[PDB]
Amino acid sequence: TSIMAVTFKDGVILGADSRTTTGAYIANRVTDKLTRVHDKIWCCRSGSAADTQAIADIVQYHLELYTSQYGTPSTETAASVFKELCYENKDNLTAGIIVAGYDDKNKGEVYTIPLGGSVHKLPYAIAGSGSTFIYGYCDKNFRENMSKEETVDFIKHSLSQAIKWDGSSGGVIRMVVLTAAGVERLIFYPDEYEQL
Template sequence: MDSINVDINHLKKGEVNLGTSIMAVTFKDGVILGADSRTTTGSYIANRVTDKLTQIHDKVWCCRSGSAADTQAVADIVKYHLDMYKANNGRSPTTKIAASLFQELCYNNKDNLTAGIICAGYDEKNGGEVYSIPLGGSIHKHEYTIAGSGSVFVYGWCKKNFKPQMTQEETINFIKTALSQAIRWDGSSGGVIRMVILTKAGIERLIFYPNEYVDA
């Protein structure tokens, strides 16, 4: 795929921030992405119900953290290139291709972006896959990954409680508990918990309100 040259210097960073808790977890049937929904402008909560889970292409989604403007712009650019990839090649792009596009954009514009991305997806050949593209534009493949300001509070809990090849219900509970604790301790995280489940059966979206996760 040709190199992507995009000038993102015009984006204004730091005004609206997705101070956040995001994660993606592989399980035996696919992958689940999860995120809180709070968007902040400094200490002011600009939006309590932001959707930080963005569909990039069919069963490839991303979680966004950092500057809301930067991450949305990068996601839109990647979505465009994946649509072009399918049109030119007659097949859907893999999660790895999508993650590589995120990595190239974030690395080439690392001095102008505040964007941390988790790219996750499912296809029948590779199953569920998770890639993290942190600030600076490196790329890392994981069985699960967490990111955002709330992630520092749950690294230990996730490492202790993650199990490969969990069931869907176990994975939902794992994500709900991790994000509920991140929300509890991180002042920049809050709102509802949103999830996207990607499997052979299709795409399923879940939402948990505070009264459904505060005791998780």
């Protein structure tokens, strides 16, 4: 996988490729690695497909039960639940998850959770095998308080390069926009992003 989440003026956008593998065989070329744990709290999944799905399912359950009792959970709270599962079961998990959500008080927020189960709040986060190839690019190009169109272009160009170099990444570029306006799903096909 190549995955990322980026905060901007109006909120936050998540991004991901659509490739799942067993060795060099592509088991799924249209995977959806962007996953809803709450209305406006989503995550990007990387690592073991089984582990990240099982975790996301448990988190979605926890936040649904949270909402029933205490109302809408914060993005930080969601990240804490992910952490708790990842940290306490670190010996048996291979999961690299980026948590992203939109509050009206806190606006856009991004938390990344690597293998060990540590939590890191960042303006933007990149993860997955393909992220290695775009550390240079993303650091040079990211600005705070970007517009929606600028942030979409930033993620599109970034994942395009990650996909280009990483064999484990490919397919379509999925994106999920989280703002006050609501939730928007974007898709971008090879013919567009390859020739960027």
